[PDB]
């Protein structure tokens, strides 16, 4: 049951936009809402509006009086001397709650005229006509206007609606909540050479009487929220999908072949999401818009998605096809379960984020294989256990503070840190995988189909929300639908992993009792760390003995420590028979390293990742080597690679080398075995016999049979030896001699890989392989032996580093004339120049990176150069570079770059709270408090980034470096 927090119900909204002026960056328009009051004596009506100048408001064609105030413009007063962050977080939460449409509130308060009170008490319709104007928007609509001359279509100027969550208040007045569903009528009067893309279906396109402008009329009969309404106006090249004909793809001019190749996969994503769920795609059209200077890499609205143009690749670009493919897939998953089925509160957001991430993981499983699915699930689980042990924990479904261990309030999406938002979505889809583990996948897809079917029976009624609230899901409704389809309720699993905000830590060690033939496990939990919680459920453990692989369920109550499980025979060591594996197959194992008295070959605690856990198991090194070689699970091979770094014995070198030589191993395991072999080789110097590690293996796999030092000409058509070939010198460059310097046998090998590179014969590009070659050249740089702080000049350069510097100079200059796909070699060469500057080789001068961080460059070059400037101002304690970065945060045209500068200055801070630095003035505290209070008031993501930066630099209490 859904009861509105608003005293009115909104039925229909007309959004008309005229006079989109690109020179002056200005729009004019009106908005006409059709509300039905649910309570009599409505009097004031409270709507949401930011940055719009409200000209006039007429209610039922009668002139009404409005008052506007935004408390989130300046959160705390300018003349308050408070400088602690808990004060700002409480004031910012109160300010966002005072404009919240999820309460009754709002920023624009319109007073109902007196003569309509007899129209409002007996509950009859009210039609509110606001007309507004955006004079030069700092948020919401982003105007990308290039400085080439010509007409606005000839130079490539466009507008798009940017922002996250409820940010539609930034470009027209609305009820900007996900729970106020209404039908829509959208008119946009644009130039005759431009096209206006928006939500709904385009009913017509009429000309103006001078035929210089045309009006696009859109209609949206599926009741969506105001937060799902978008806009993209530009000189877009239109491409109808040749497979599905209601799907149109819009790109920027001159990028039509890239659009043709890139969006050619999307029909398979549509077919997948419509056959695992049994509902068809709910909207009547689908539109993909590719734009420049995007807010996020992929945004999903109702019947529309806005991607950045940096996803567009051609047919000869690999290492970008899977990333763009999965961006399209998660946009479509959010089309199904973020835009059609919406949110009932700010709680129950974990339901939608979990269903979106879970069905996108099912797509990844079918498309890229179960092994890529397991690797992705393991990397997401490692991400969340790292974040939750780092700071507190992520609390899905809080109850309204519920989480006081962290420096922001979790009551609203616009007060969350961006890393918390990312980990929120990550934990939501892992908890949905856990619900699939308890209640099987076919019942899970039946739950999702029941939700979609209730929403689509709801979506066709005309009753104003008598039935339109069946399109809003809640937690209680989701659990009730689960209990309807399965008969089991998941309330212990919901109580543990949703309502409680923690992950578990397992420390395991075994001992084999030879007398009674049992395996005595010893599993203890660390439950006193700040991020942890105590697990009391069951726990699966998989033991591989000589007779095969056996699963055991252990009951781990609070007082439990020793778990005795039984062991089988050892009669497959009496005769040589094959040892049967986890799957149905069996292999020949070399049992010379195994103990004579124990049959068990390896043990895995929680193999299926059925809890949110971090396992620290103490096996013997031969058990880790057997688990690396003969396991049929990629997460166990990865964890054995990760645990073999502590055992540098030559049997582990043989194990990793046999993994590296082995095709029919998953390629991301061999790419990890490269770096593990490099670390082991560094640890057993003065024992290593022959050549450096992986060199003979590289010449055996990727070089000519007649010439060992000449590499084969590039043929990248295998896509697994391409990735292994481009990752093996990067790990090989981490080799070090007894003198702690990279050997001149590996550096010469990398330089010969660079010289003899011929790419005139493959059908694929070479930009990522050459960029990884520059990364391998950067990995070999050891710190220089400066004497008496000698100035680093050209004559006293290292003889090794002069070759590296010549190569990166040649590569960067050749990129200036023949550019790569996304300037990958510019990014790699800037990263390598920063590596050479971090050691004492090149003079520590930020002027090159400051010239590459200007506005007109590509955004990857910009963020690489700004990363180099952030690293410089951390190491050299530069005041003027920090003022340069803070000025670039305040006034840069691209808001993604501002968010990225705040992000990089949070990750690599110039000082922490513990450090005494020269950059701990009252002036810097006043600048960052002014940046939290004012200055970042237009983005909701820059303000949370400024809160994160103030927390990283000065902590939760009063800045110490202050009177």
């Amino acid at each position: 049951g859904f009861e509105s927090p608003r005293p009115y119900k909104l039925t229909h909204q007309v959004v008309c936009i005229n006079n989109i002026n690109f020179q002056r960056k200005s729009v004019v328009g009106f908005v006409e809402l059709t509300i039905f009051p649910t309570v009599a004596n409505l009097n004031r009506i409270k709507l949401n509006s930011k940055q719009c100048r409200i000209y006039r408001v007429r209610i039922n064609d009668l002139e009404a009086a409005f008052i506007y105030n935004d408390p989130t413009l300046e959160v705390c007063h300018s003349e308050s001397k408070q400088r602690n962050l808990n004060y700002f977080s409480n004031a910012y939460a109160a300010a966002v709650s005072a404009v919240d449409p999820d309460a009754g509130n709002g920023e624009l308060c319109i007073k109902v005229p007196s003569e309509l009170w007899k129209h409002v008490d007996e509950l009859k319709v009210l039609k509110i006509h606001i007309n507004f104007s955006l004079d030069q928007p700092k948020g919401g609509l982003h105007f990308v206007v290039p400085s080439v001359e010509g007409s606005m279509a000839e130079r490539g100027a466009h507008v798009f609606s940017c922002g996250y969550q409820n940010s539609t208040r930034f470009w027209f007045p609305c009820v900007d909540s996900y729970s106020e569903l209404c039908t829509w009528k959208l008119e946009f009067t644009v130039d005759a050479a431009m096209v206006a893309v928006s939500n709904g279906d385009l009913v017509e396109t009429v000309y103006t009487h001078d035929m210089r402008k045309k009006t696009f009329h859109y209609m949206l009969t599926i009741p969506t929220a105001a937060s799902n309404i978008s806009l993209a106006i530009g000189p877009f090249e239109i491409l109808v999908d040749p497979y599905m004909h209601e799907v149109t793809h819009f790109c920027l001019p001159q990028l039509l072949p890239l659009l043709k190749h890139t969006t050619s996969y999307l029909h398979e994503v549509f077919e997948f999401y419509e056959e695992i769920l049994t509902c068809r795609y709910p909207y009547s059209c689908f539109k993909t818009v590719f734009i420049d200077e995007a807010y996020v890499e992929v945004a999903a609205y109702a019947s529309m998605s806005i991607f950045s143009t940096n996803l567009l690749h051609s047919a000869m670009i690999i290492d970008e096809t899977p990333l763009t493919r999965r961006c399209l897939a998660q946009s479509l998953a959010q089309q199904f379960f973020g835009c059609f089925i919406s949110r009932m509160s700010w709680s129950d957001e974990w339901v939608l984020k979990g269903i979106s991430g879970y069905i996108y993981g099912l797509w990844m499983k079918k498309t890229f294989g179960v092994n890529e699915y397991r690797h992705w699930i393991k990397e997401e689980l490692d991400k969340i256990v790292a974040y939750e042990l780092k700071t507190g924990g992520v609390l899905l479904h809080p109850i309204f503070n519920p989480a006081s261990h962290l420096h922001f309030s979790i009551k609203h999406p616009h007060t969350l840190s961006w890393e918390y938002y990312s980990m929120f979505q990550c934990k939501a889809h892992l908890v949905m995988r856990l619900i699939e583990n308890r209640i099987s996948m076919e019942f899970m897809l039946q739950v999702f189909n029941k939700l979609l079917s209730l929403a689509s029976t709801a979506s066709s009624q005309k009753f104003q929300s008598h039935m339109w609230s069946q399109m809003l899901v809640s937690t209680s409704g989701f659990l009730k639908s689960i209990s309807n389809v399965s008969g089991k309720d998941i309330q212990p699993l919901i109580k543990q992993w949703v309502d409680q905000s923690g992950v578990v830590k397992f420390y395991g060690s075994f001992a084999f009792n030879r007398k009674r033939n049992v395996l005595e496990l010893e599993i203890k939990q660390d439950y006193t760390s700040p991020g942890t919680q105590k697990y009391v459920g069951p726990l699966k453990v998989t033991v591989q003995e000589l007779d095969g692989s056996f699963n055991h369920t252990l009951q781990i109550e609070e007082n439990s420590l020793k778990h005795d499980i039984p062991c089988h025979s050892k009669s497959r060591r009496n005769k040589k028979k094959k040892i049967p594996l986890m799957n149905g197959e069996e292999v020949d194992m070399d049992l010379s390293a195994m103990d004579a008295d124990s049959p068990l070959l390896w043990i895995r605690i929680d193999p299926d990742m059925s809890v949110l856990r971090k396992v620290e198991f103490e096996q013997a090194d031969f058990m880790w080597q057997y688990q690396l070689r003969y396991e049929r699970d990629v997460v166990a091979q990865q964890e054995s690679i990760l645990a073999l770094e502590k055992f540098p014995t030559p049997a582990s070198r043989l194990a990793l080398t046999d993994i590296l030589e082995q095709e029919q191993c998953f390629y991301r395991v061999r790419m990890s075995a490269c770096f593990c072999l490099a670390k082991i080789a560094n640890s057993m110097v003065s024992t290593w016999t022959g050549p450096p590690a992986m060199k003979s293996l590289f010449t055996r796999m990727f070089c000519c049979k007649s010439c060992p030092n000449i590499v084969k000409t590039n043929n990248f058509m295998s896509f697994q030896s391409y990735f292994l070939q481009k990752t093996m010198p990067v790990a090989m460059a981490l080799l070090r001699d007894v003198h702690n310097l990279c050997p001149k046998e590996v550096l010469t090998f990398i330089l010969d890989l660079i010289k003899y590179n011929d790419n005139r014969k493959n059908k694929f590009s070479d930009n990522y392989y050459r960029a990884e070659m520059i990364d391998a050249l950067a990995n070999s740089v050891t710190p220089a032996v400066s004497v008496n702080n000698e100035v680093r000049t050209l004559d006293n350069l290292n003889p090794d580093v002069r070759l590296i510097l010549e190569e990166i100079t040649r590569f960067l200059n050749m990129e200036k004339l023949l550019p790569s796909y996304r300037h990958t070699i510019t990014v790699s060469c800037l990263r390598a120049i920063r590596v050479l500057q971090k050691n004492g080789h090149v003079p520590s001068d930020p002027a090159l990176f400051k010239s590459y961080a200007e506005y007109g460059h590509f955004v990857d070059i910009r963020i690489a150069a700004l990363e180099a400037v952030v690293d410089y101002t951390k190491v050299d304690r530069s005041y003027e570079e920090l003022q340069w970065l803070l000025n670039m945060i305040q006034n840069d045209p691209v808001p993604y770059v501002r968010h990225k500068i705040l992000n990089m200055l949070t990750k690599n801070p110039p000082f922490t709270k513990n450090m005494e630095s020269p950059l701990c003035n009252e002036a810097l505290v006043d600048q960052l408090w002014k940046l939290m209070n004012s200055g970042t008031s237009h983005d909701w993501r820059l303000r949370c980034g400024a809160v994160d930066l103030y927390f990283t630099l000065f902590g939760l209490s009063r800045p110490s470096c202050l009177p």
Partner: peptide, 25 residues
């Protein structure tokens, strides 16, 4: 300037056209 000269970075008015577009096709 004699040893290791770098061509100076010039800003483009539209950078995606010189980044994303293929030149040999």
């Amino acid at each position: 300037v004699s040893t290791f000269p770098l061509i100076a970075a010039r800003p483009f008015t539209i950078p995606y056209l010189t980044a994303l577009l293929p030149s040999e096709l």
